[PDB]
Amino acid sequence: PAFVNKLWSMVNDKSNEKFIHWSTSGESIVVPNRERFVQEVLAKYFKHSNFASFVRQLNMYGWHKVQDVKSGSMLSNNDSRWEFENERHA
Amino acid sequence: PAFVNKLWSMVNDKSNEKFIHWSTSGESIVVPNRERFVQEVLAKYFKHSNFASFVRQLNMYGWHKVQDVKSGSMLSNNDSRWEFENE
């Protein structure tokens, strides 16, 4: 499961904090901005790969996008912000 | 315009994983088996259509088949395996 080793080598390396990190609250991995993450981190740990390909791998290992939160009167959601939770830790 | 929504509504729906998905490899859409794809997925998202029609649509939107790779002493290629990459 090489993916796993790469995932953690990426998430648990503080140098990638601004682009991907464990959430302050709850038990989840947060990607503040999909585009910047793809540009600065994904390209480094997962050569010639894209977001959908990455997320597909995460799913394979139990991680799934968290239910979206509709904010304010606009029922808005930052489509670029992604939060992932593992099925084994709800 | 409508083909696009259909394509992604199909590719990015995890329920279609076994028939069509993003390559674990590098930036491409993979159709493990053409025949199974046609009868189990295409038949649902693109009623009254066929593989050639679908691929033609893909081509028009920038996606094309990746160069074949001949494997082993037989220089073989699984004609049913289709992988597409964007322009």
B58-70 residues labelled b (16+ CB within 10 A) or e (exposed): beeeebeeeeeee
Resolution value, angstrom units: 2.0
Preferred mutation among B24, B30, B66 to probe A, highest tally of A CBs within 10 A: B24
Deposited experimental method:
X-ray
Distance from CA of A47 to the nearest CA of B (A): 8
Tally of helices (H runs) and strands (E runs) in chain A? 4, 4
* Amino acid sitting at position B6: K
B24 touches chain A (CB under 8 A): yes
Find all residues with CB under 8 Å of A4, minimum gap 6, and list them.
Answer: A61
Give which of B6, B62, B75, B65 is closest to B34, Cα–Cα.
B65
Do the Cβ atoms of A57 and B27 come within 8 Å?
Answer: no
State phi, psi for A19 to the nearest 5 degrees. Answer: -110, -25
The two structure tokens encoding residue B3 = 């083909």
Nearest of A21, A23, A29, A26 to residue A64 by alpha carbon: A29
Residue A43 touches chain B, beta carbons under 8 Å: no
Please name the residues in contact with A19: beta carbons below 8 A apart, sequence gap of 6 or more. Answer: A31, A32, A33, A36, A37, A40, A41
- Domain A1-90 annotated CATH 2.60.40.1220: no
Instruction: State residue A66 phi and psi, 5-degree precision.
Output: -75, 150
CATH 2.60.40.10 fits B1-87, yes or no: no
Contact A83, A31 (CB under 8 A): yes
Sole residue written with tokens 């025949």: B35
Nearest residue to A58 (alpha-carbon basis) of A89, A18, A79, A87: A87
